[PDB]
Amino acid sequence: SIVKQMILNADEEVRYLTPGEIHALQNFYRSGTERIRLAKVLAQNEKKIVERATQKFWKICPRTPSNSGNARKTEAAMRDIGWYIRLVSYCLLAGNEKPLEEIGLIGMKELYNSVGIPLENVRQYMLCVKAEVSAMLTPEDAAEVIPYFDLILQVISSPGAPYFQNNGRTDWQR
Amino acid sequence: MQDAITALINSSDVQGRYLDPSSLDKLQNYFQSGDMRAKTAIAVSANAKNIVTKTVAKSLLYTDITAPGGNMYTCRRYAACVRDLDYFLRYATYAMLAGDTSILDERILNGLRETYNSLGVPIGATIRSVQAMKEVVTSLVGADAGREMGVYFDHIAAGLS
Amino acid sequence: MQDAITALINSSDVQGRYLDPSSLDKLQNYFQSGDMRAKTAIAVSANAKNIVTKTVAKSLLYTDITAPGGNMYTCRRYAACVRDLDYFLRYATYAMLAGDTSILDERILNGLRETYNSLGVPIGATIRSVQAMKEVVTSLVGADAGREMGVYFDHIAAGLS
Amino acid sequence: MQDAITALINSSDVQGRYLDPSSLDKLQNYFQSGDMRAKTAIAVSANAKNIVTKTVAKSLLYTDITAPGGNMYTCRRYAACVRDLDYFLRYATYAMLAGDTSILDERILNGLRETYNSLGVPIGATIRSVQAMKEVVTSLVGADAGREMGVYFDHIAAGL
Amino acid sequence: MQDKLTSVAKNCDLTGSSLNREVVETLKEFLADGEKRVQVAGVIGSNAAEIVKTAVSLLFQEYPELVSPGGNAYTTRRYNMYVRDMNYFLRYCSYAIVAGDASVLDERLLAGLRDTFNSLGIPLGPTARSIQLMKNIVKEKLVTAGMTNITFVDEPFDYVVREISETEI
Amino acid sequence: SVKASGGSPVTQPQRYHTVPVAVISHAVQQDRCLKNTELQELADFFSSGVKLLEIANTLTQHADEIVLAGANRIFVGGSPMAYLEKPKEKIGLPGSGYYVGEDFLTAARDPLPGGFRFINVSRYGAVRMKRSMRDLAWFLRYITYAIVAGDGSILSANVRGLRGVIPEDVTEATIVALRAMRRQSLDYFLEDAEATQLVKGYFDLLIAEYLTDKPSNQVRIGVSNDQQGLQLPQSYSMSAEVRPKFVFKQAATLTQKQEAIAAIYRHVFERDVTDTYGFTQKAELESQLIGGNISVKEFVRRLGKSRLYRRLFYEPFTISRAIELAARHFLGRGLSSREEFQTYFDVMTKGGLPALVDAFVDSAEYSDYFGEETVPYLRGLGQEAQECRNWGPQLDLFKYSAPVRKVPQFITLFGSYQKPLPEQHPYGCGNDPLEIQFGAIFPQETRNPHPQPAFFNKDTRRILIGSGAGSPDKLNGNALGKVPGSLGTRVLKLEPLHGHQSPSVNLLHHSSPAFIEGAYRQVFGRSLYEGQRQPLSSTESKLLGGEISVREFVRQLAKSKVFRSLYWDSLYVTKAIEYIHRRLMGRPTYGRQEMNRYYDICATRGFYALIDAIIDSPEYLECFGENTVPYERYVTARGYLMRSPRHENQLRRETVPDKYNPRKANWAA
Amino acid sequence: SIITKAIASADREARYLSPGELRTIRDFYNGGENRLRIATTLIENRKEIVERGSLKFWECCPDTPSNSGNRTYRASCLRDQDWYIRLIAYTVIVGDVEPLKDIGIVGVKEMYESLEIPLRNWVECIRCLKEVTLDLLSREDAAEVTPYFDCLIQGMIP
Ligand SMILES: *[C@H](C)[C@H]1/C(=C/c2[nH]c(/C=C3N=C(/C=C4\NC(=O)C(CC)=C4C)C(C)=C\3CCC(=O)O)c(CCC(=O)O)c2C)NC(=O)[C@@H]1C
Ligand SMILES: *[C@H](C)[C@H]1/C(=C/c2[nH]c(/C=C3N=C(/C=C4\NC(=O)C(CC)=C4C)C(C)=C\3CCC(=O)O)c(CCC(=O)O)c2C)NC(=O)[C@@H]1C
Numbered sequence A: 001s002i003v004k005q006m007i008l009n010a011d012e013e014v015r016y017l018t019p020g021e022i023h024a025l026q027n028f029y030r031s032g033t034e035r036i037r038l039a040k041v042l043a044q045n046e047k048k049i050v051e052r053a054t055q056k057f058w059k060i061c062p063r064t065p066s067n068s069g070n071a072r073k074t075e076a077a078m079r080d081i082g083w084y085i086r087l088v089s090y091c092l093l094a095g096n097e098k099p100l101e102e103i104g105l106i107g108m109k110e111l112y113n114s115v116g117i118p119l120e121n122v123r124q125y126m127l128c129v130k131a132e133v134s135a136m137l138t139p140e141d142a143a144e145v146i147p148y149f150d151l152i153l154q155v156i157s158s159p160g161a162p163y164f165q166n167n168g169r170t171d172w173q174r
Numbered sequence B, C: 001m002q003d004a005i006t007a008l009i010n011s012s013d014v015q016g017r018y019l020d021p022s023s024l025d026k027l028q029n030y031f032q033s034g035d036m037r038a039k040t041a042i043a044v045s046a047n048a049k050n051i052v053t054k055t056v057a058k059s060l061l062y063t064d065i066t067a068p069g070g071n072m073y074t075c076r077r078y079a080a081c082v083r084d085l086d087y088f089l090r091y092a093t094y095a096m097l098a099g100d101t102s103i104l105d106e107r108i109l110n111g112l113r114e115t116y117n118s119l120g121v122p123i124g125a126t127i128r129s130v131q132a133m134k135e136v137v138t139s140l141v142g143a144d145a146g147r148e149m150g151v152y153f154d155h156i157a158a159g160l161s
Numbered sequence D: 001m002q003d004a005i006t007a008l009i010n011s012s013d014v015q016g017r018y019l020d021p022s023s024l025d026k027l028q029n030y031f032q033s034g035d036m037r038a039k040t041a042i043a044v045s046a047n048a049k050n051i052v053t054k055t056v057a058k059s060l061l062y063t064d065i066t067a068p069g070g071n072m073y074t075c076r077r078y079a080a081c082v083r084d085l086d087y088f089l090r091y092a093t094y095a096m097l098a099g100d101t102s103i104l105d106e107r108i109l110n111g112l113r114e115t116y117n118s119l120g121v122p123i124g125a126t127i128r129s130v131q132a133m134k135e136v137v138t139s140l141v142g143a144d145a146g147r148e149m150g151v152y153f154d155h156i157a158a159g160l
Numbered sequence E: 001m002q003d004k005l006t007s008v009a010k011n012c013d014l015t016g017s018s019l020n021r022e023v024v025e026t027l028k029e030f031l032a033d034g035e036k037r038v039q040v041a042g043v044i045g046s047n048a049a050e051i052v053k054t055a056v057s058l059l060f061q062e063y064p065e066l067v068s069p070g071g072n073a074y075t076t077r078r079y080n081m082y083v084r085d086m087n088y089f090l091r092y093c094s095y096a097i098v099a100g101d102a103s104v105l106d107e108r109l110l111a112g113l114r115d116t117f118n119s120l121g122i123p124l125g126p127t128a129r130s131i132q133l134m135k136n137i138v139k140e141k142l143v144t145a146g147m148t149n150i151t152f153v154d155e156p157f158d159y160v161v162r163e164i165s166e167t168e169i
Numbered sequence F: 001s002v003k004a005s006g007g008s009p010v011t012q013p014q015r016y017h018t019v020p021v022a023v024i025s026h027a028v029q030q031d032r033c034l035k036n037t038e039l040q041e042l043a044d045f046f047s048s049g050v051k052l053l054e055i056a057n058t059l060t061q062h063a064d065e066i067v068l069a070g071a072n073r074i075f076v077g078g079s080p081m082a083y084l085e086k087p088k089e090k091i092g093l094p095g096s097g098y099y100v101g102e103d104f105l106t107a108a109r110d111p112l113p114g115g116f117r118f119i120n121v122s123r124y125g126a127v128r129m130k131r132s133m134r135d136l137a138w139f140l141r142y143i144t145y146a147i148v149a150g151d152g153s154i155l156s157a158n159v160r161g162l163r164g165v166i167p168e169d170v171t172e173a174t175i176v177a178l179r180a181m182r183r184q185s186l187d188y189f190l191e192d193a194e195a196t197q198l199v200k201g202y203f204d205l206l207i208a209e210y211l212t213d214k215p216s217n218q219v220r221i222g223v224s225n226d227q228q229g230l231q232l233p234q235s236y237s238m239s240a241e242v243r244p245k246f247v248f249k250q251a252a253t254l255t256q257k258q259e260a261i262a263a264i265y266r267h268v269f270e271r272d273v274t275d276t277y278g279f280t281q282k283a284e285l286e287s288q289l290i291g292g293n294i295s296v297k298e299f300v301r302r303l304g305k306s307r308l309y310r311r312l313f314y315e316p317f318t319i320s321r322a323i324e325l326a327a328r329h330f331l332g333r334g335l336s337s338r339e340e341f342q343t344y345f346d347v348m349t350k351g352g353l354p355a356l357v358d359a360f361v362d363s364a365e366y367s368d369y370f371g372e373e374t375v376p377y378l379r380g381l382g383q384e385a386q387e388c389r390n391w392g393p394q395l396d397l398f399k400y401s402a403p404v405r406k407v408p409q410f411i412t413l414f415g416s417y418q419k420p421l422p423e424q425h426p427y428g429c430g431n432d433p434l435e436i437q438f439g440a441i442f443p444q445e446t447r448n449p450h451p452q453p454a455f456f457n458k459d460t461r462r463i464l465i466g467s468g469a470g471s472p473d474k475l476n477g478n479a480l481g482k483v484p485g486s487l488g489t490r491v492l493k494l495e496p497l498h499g500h501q502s503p504s505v506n507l508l509h510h511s512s513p514a515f516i517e518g519a520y521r522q523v524f525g526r527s528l529y530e531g532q533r534q535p536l537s538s539t540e541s542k543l544l545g546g547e548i549s550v551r552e553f554v555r556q557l558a559k560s561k562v563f564r565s566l567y568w569d570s571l572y573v574t575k576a577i578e579y580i581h582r583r584l585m586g587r588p589t590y591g592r593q594e595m596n597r598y599y600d601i602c603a604t605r606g607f608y609a610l611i612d613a614i615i616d617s618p619e620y621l622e623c624f625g626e627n628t629v630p631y632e633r634y635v636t637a638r639g640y641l642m643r644s645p646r647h648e649n650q651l652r653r654e655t656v657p658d659k660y661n662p663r664k665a666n667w668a669a
Numbered sequence G: 001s002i003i004t005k006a007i008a009s010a011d012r013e014a015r016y017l018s019p020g021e022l023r024t025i026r027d028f029y030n031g032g033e034n035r036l037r038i039a040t041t042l043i044e045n046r047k048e049i050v051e052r053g054s055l056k057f058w059e060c061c062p063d064t065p066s067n068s069g070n071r072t073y074r075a076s077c078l079r080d081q082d083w084y085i086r087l088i089a090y091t092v093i094v095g096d097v098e099p100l101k102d103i104g105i106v107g108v109k110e111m112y113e114s115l116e117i118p119l120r121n122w123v124e125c126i127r128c129l130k131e132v133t134l135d136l137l138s139r140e141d142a143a144e145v146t147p148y149f150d151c152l153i154q155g156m157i158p
């Protein structure tokens, strides 16, 4: 959380929190009710967002482990997406991205390499999830929540799309 | 020495490209401001002696700097301080006309601190005098042209500090 | 500077004694190699500009150094690099004639590194250019004289690092 | 650090072409000489102390630099000179095994002139010592192996 | 490193003019654009990988010899270094946009950059071109997001170019 | 803004691994000759080199067939080999003799994966097709390179992370093509079972490493808020040379423990100096390490506090240089910022050298990198992401000549980063002579090196302190200058001469020998020896008879062989230019404009043309005319300060009380 | 400042500024105008603050070098009081103790021990100045200003 980060920074330098850090903490405390409301909103819309995002993702990328005819793989993919939405809600509550980093971002690429899931498929799935979250939430709620999904995407966005050394045609598949 | 146009041309030339629309817009801004720059140069040239007189009066006179044992004591050192203020005013006017601070980097601030420390010239008093000169010039040429000249006065002062 | 004969003379002179038989043998070796040194000097003098042209073509052309924004970009910087290469070739010929690298240390290398660092000249690129020049000279002259000149080219390259 | 194979691969790769017959011939010569190069590396590793002893005896002992006021005076500076000679021999062996002089340019000549000039070590005496070491190595490991070691000995000497 | 407010506050004591009218006016002008600076930084951070990828692809389009044999972007090792360094530049430019001051660029990006690039043979022309491409892409994204007065976004990138490019005139 | 430069060391980063390079690098970093096992490895590699060359030649001769086999497996609806661009030889380069004279006209005359979809050549585009074909040919070429090098590193470092750089849409296709190529390659031996094994291994390594999906960058987290965090792609680490890391284990045999201890000595002392200096107390420390009482961390801490470390890396150096060296010895890296130097300087001021050693060893960074059992090792280029701010200083610190430089290299650069251009010659501090009466005294680059280059552009103009010398008529424009040791109005001037013999006693301000000696003392800085004036006697006569002016006499003096030997023959060219300019013009050059002009004159025509250019300059005529011997008119800041060593007049330090009954409380009982 | 602290924290981890840090920075940029108004109030009233506080300080701490009959000592003490009031105003502009700490808290004990000026007398003077300042500020503005006085006092206590 932000309070934990301030305390760790102060303890590293062996000093009490400065007045500015205390004022930032007070602002964070004052924003707590709105943060909790946003987290509740995200929690209540988890299942429908996941379902719609899965539909869009299967429409986009069919050649995926979650669309290989295995029910276990489909359940696991939907569960992973729900987990990432849950971590984003944790970030909303905590005031920073540390829950996301410490639960689902550090080592995420290594985990998916070991499990066997292509990370571009994960990126496309998360883009679909971000689109669904933007569609469902109000513009303010989206403006507050989407940055964490963009933070997730930034981890698994390189190397990859876009590609510009082409003629722009996508029908070359044959 | 580079002015605004030469700086834009240099930035485009290292890339081997013609001036992009952003640099062309900057060039048009410089051309539009050229008339005000010429007017400010004329105004500062017409009042250079008075500007330096007021700067010395409001920042250096009747202090311990002009007293015996001060760095502006004796006529030679007083004249040298006035000459230095003339230098700063003239080169700030040059930089304002060019729209670029490179002239101050290459001809004013290079080795200025070492030279002043070698001679014993007070750096803080020089910075305060430059601030006073900026205030005088702003009162003389107005708020907008005053701020434009103050950009280069502040560049000199920041280089001295 | 100082050549082979002067080097042996000074080695004997710091001890205050005549040249010992080993120094006499070294002097005889230099005297016998003088003919080859003169022929190599003639060959390098005849084709100096061609040698530098081949060096630039081999090591510098069509690289990012001559591209816009590079250090050999613009005609003045290209000509300055060519001038430095001409200096290197002429002084390598001098050192080969003298049989000693003393002139290279005195005239070329004592301050070249700091000068290049101040100018932003890529030292790795100029070392590669000097090695390419050594290759060009050894192709023009021969193997034995090419190796003799490459001794001093290698000394220049080592002094540049 | 770069060996002959790296140099040839890089020269072919800069122009984006496979190994032409000239580069294949150079690589073949390097590989075929590798047997005797490893043999003489073994011999030098076995006789490094003797090589340095003979070199010092025939190039530095009983001269002015050993008498008081010389740079090899005091046991500390004698040991430092012997250590420098060992360094030169070991890195010459490295450069021979690599078939390239990059190791010498990277870890010997890079800062050698500055070190010797700041400490006052005479360059000429060091050059004579390196020459004596080259002669001793040639007499120990044979004619051709001695010559291909002397190439790198001369590279070190010309670097100074 | 310092941000705009810290530098202005310290200069208030340094120059001896204290909190006069010009300082107050500059502070008010800077604080007027603070929310836009935060928004610009958020946009840059949310699209960093896309910006860097687009800029590097356009750079290789305008410098096709860079990826050819003998080029500096030749092989995936050097390609990855290109992407890494462009990410460095974008990150520190976003920092400078937030702070409103170029001291972060001076202390953590440009100090010794020329020495490193001369040591490694990194060409400065393509570096400036890639920085300008990233700047153009960021401006396009900001216009797409609906931002209007985003002149300050030009300041870091251009500045960095002026600091790394060689003197031609 | 950032004009200070730490210099650009010549670095040659490793791009891939070769068997000889790997073996020799491992031997080098341990400071010992090749082992028997390593020599055996080298011999085995060399004896097999002919077979590797034959394999690579076989693959090269059939490169078109192999690439065609790869391309035909994935491309349909076109001819892929039409898009394969071969390298083009650069013929007719300048100086090649291709064109004689200025005449240029006569020179001429395996099952596919499930659901695999092929790629339509026409719809894929020319750009992408050329990309693909060059990629296949490049893969084959690097496979032959790996075969010759004896190491697949050139593949692994260049295909890990390639997936995604090559579009993710075609990664599967790429694999298919590679496998096809592999098949074709294996069709070209079919009789060895060893060459086939090698080709199979290299192709499998390429496929396996290419299949890695977005490998994570190695992050270097800043150790404090004054240090930046960085990232290094895995390819850079893989291609770089390998650090042999030693881990001390109490269960290891005595020989392995002694090897780790030798590594500790080689790192902390830059060399195993323990035997040379009679470090007998080492034995006790070694026991405390071998028995497991203390760790490598405590062993290094005790080594840093030993008398040997103090003798080697504290006594010869100042506090700043000692801190800079201890950074390398206890952290394997140089100092990052001036704030880090400030903290370590405060630590050293408070507690001394043991406190500094404790601050280094007890830091979280030490335990992060070396923990308790790992021997400290040198970090740097290729081991982790490097900073630009300490690039040059750290590269120079890692060299063996680091303990030979006494002037600090980090705090000076870190201080000058925050400052404008220094007061120095545009070509560096080594191009500034001592401003003395005579003698060209310059800082030698290789002796006590302290060069501080700065990025002076061609238009910088130096600030000079006027000396105030000159005749009263040639004053009042720059009369505000005053420099100690200046003979103000004592300039040497000789009015030109205009059928009867002269009187016996005719007196000028200076007698003819006195004026000639003054001219010699100004041009040469000092009086010459007895016979040295012999070559110029006729010139002196022409000056006494009015044939030539003082300007021509000065020009002839500066053109003499004595002047050339004193100030040109054994001087760096621009150092000679600067000194001759100071002697003849009376001032240092302003900047790179004059320096470049005179350097070009020296390069094209030589020394005499340089003398002519200086003497014939309009400024020389303005300042000295035809009848005045030159004199010193400007000095630098340092030259001015060297002539002003007394400041007792400015230390005058800094009455009736202003309060009645001071230092008393109100309403005291 | 908090902007600089956030940028340094992000830089250490080689990451862009996170949404939470950006929200914090936006909040302080929003509060900048209020902090500027408070600092302007401090600056415009600095002479009365120093006058009243110095009179109170010489009442409560008479055995101090400034209150000893030396005109130079008294002038320097008053100059220092004005200096610290202005520094507190500037650090209020910034919004964090960093400028005031960098200019006049780090090494203040060493500087005034070299000058042979008791640091407890300085603590008493800063207490008097803080009381006088709090007399002319609202509680909300005092919540912004007082912690910098307290930081200075803590940095001055031996
Ligand atoms: C009196 C005969 C004439 C005159 C004089 C006048 N002077 C001032 C102010 C200053 N005078 C000096 C003089 C000197 N500084 C030096 O270093 C030396 C050499 C040792 C001298 C002679 C200076 C420095 C000042 C500035 C004030 C200060 O004390 O720092 C004034 C006052 C001008 C003003 O108030 O602006 C006057 C009037 N005036 C006459 O009418 C006489 C002809
Ligand atoms: C006046 C505001 C302050 C002051 C100044 C002072 N300066 C000098 C002497 C010199 N000033 C310079 C500066 C420059 N020369 C240049 O060419 C340029 C660039 C255009 C600059 C900035 C120099 C070189 C000198 C040395 C002497 C000379 O004129 O050549 C003095 C006299 C120092 C002496 O005793 O020699 C003084 C007093 N002093 C103050 O106290 C003011 C705050």
Ligand SMILES: *[C@H](C)[C@H]1/C(=C/c2[nH]c(/C=C3N=C(/C=C4\NC(=O)C(CC)=C4C)C(C)=C\3CCC(=O)O)c(CCC(=O)O)c2C)NC(=O)[C@@H]1C
Pocket (backbone or CB within 6 Å): C060, C061, C062, C063, C066, C067, C072, C073, C074, C075, C078, F092, F093, F094
């Ligand atoms: C065309 C009008 C004439 C001509 C051209 C020609 N050029 C080259 C090669 C080079 N040209 C340059 C030019 C410049 N470099 C600079 O920095 C500037 C200032 C902006 C200029 C004009 C350079 C550096 C080269 C070298 C190659 C490189 O770019 O690295 C050639 C040589 C081609 C070859 O390799 O043989 C030629 C022929 N030829 C004509 O017939 C015209 C008269």
Ligand SMILES: *[C@H](C)[C@H]1/C(=C/c2[nH]c(/C=C3N=C(/C=C4\NC(=O)C(CC)=C4C)C(C)=C\3CCC(=O)O)c(CCC(=O)O)c2C)NC(=O)[C@@H]1C
Pocket (backbone or CB within 6 Å): C065, C071, C072, C076, C077, C078, C080, C081, C082, C084, C085, C087, C107, C108, C112, C115, C119, C121, C122, C125, C126, C129, F458, F572, F573, F574, F575, F592, F593, F595, F596, F599
């Ligand atoms: C060519 C191989 C490389 C190259 C060179 C280059 N040099 C300059 C400019 C200068 N070089 C020198 C060096 C010397 N000074 C000496 O005394 C000697 C020995 C006689 C040498 C070799 C000097 C003095 C200059 C003058 C700088 C000036 O313009 O005043 C340049 C021009 C740099 C500029 O900024 O204009 C260049 C390009 N650069 C390369 O990239 C080649 C690898």
Ligand SMILES: *[C@H](C)[C@H]1/C(=C/c2[nH]c(/C=C3N=C(/C=C4\NC(=O)C(CC)=C4C)C(C)=C\3CCC(=O)O)c(CCC(=O)O)c2C)NC(=O)[C@@H]1C
Pocket (backbone or CB within 6 Å): D060, D061, D062, D063, D066, D067, D072, D073, D074, D075, D078
């Ligand atoms: C006599 C007690 C023992 C003995 C000695 C011995 N020494 C040499 C030759 C040399 N001795 C030295 C000694 C020193 N150099 C120093 O700097 C110092 C410190 C002050 C000392 C003690 C050196 C350098 C030499 C080399 C020759 C020279 O002096 O130039 C020899 C001859 C070696 C040879 O093979 O020529 C001998 C025999 N030998 C014994 O058996 C005694 C126990």
Ligand SMILES: *[C@H](C)[C@H]1/C(=C/c2[nH]c(/C=C3N=C(/C=C4\NC(=O)C(CC)=C4C)C(C)=C\3CCC(=O)O)c(CCC(=O)O)c2C)NC(=O)[C@@H]1C
Pocket (backbone or CB within 6 Å): D065, D070, D071, D072, D076, D077, D078, D080, D081, D082, D084, D085, D087, D107, D108, D112, D115, D119, D121, D122, D125, D126, D129, F400, F401
């Ligand atoms: C012996 C042939 C001559 C000699 C040498 C001498 N050297 C030193 C000191 C040093 N020598 C080096 C050289 C290197 N160290 C390395 O690691 C490498 C690369 C492998 C090299 C080339 C160094 C670094 C030093 C300084 C550290 C040290 O003292 O060990 C000395 C001592 C100098 C002193 O006064 O301290 C000497 C005497 N001197 C001669 O006269 C011989 C001709």
Ligand SMILES: *[C@H](C)[C@H]1/C(=C/c2[nH]c(/C=C3N=C(/C=C4\NC(=O)C(CC)=C4C)C(C)=C\3CCC(=O)O)c(CCC(=O)O)c2C)NC(=O)[C@@H]1C
Pocket (backbone or CB within 6 Å): F436, F437, F438, F439, F440
């Ligand atoms: C004699 C007591 C000792 C001695 C002296 C010595 N000096 C030189 C050469 C130079 N001496 C100087 C000194 C000065 N430069 C100045 O400007 C002044 C003030 C007027 C002085 C005193 C300089 C610059 C030189 C350099 C050469 C020159 O003459 O220009 C030498 C010659 C050294 C050489 O290698 O040329 C000597 C021998 N040496 C001793 O051993 C005596 C104890």
Ligand SMILES: CCC1=C(C)/C(=C/C2=NC(=C\c3[nH]c(/C=C4\NC(=O)[C@H](C)[C@H]4CC)c(C)c3CCC(=O)O)/C(CCC(=O)O)=C2C)NC1=O
Pocket (backbone or CB within 6 Å): A163, A164, A165, A166, E057, E060, E067, E074, E075, E076, E077, E079, F119, F128, F131, F132, F133, F134, F135, F136, F138, F139, F142, F155, F158, F159, F162, F165, F166, F167, F170, F173, F174, F177
């Ligand atoms: C080890 C040797 C090596 C190789 C081969 C390599 C490949 C490589 N292929 C690239 C691009 C590319 N490569 C391909 C295509 C393909 N590539 C294939 O191997 C397939 C056969 C084919 C698809 C069927 C395309 C389409 C691009 C351009 C991607 C873009 O749009 O950016 C790039 C990016 C640079 C550029 O765009 O020019 C690299 C570095 N890198 C290396 O270091």
Ligand SMILES: CCC1=C(C)/C(=C/C2=NC(=C\c3[nH]c(/C=C4\NC(=O)[C@H](C)[C@H]4CC)c(C)c3CCC(=O)O)/C(CCC(=O)O)=C2C)NC1=O
Pocket (backbone or CB within 6 Å): E072, E073, E078, E079, E081, E082, E085, E086, E088, E108, E109, E110, E113, E116, E120, E122, E123, E124, E126, E127, E130, F013, F230, F231, F232, F381, F382, F384, F385, F386, F387, F388, F389
């Ligand atoms: C935060 C400030 C900072 C910078 C900028 C920086 C740059 C930097 N770029 C490097 C590499 C590299 N950088 C590039 C390429 C380029 N680089 C560019 O900025 C261009 C876009 C492109 C050329 C046009 C390449 C090709 C390499 C590898 C060089 C090699 O082949 O060894 C390296 C050496 C490897 C390392 O240790 O990371 C450094 C230090 N380091 C820093 O700390």
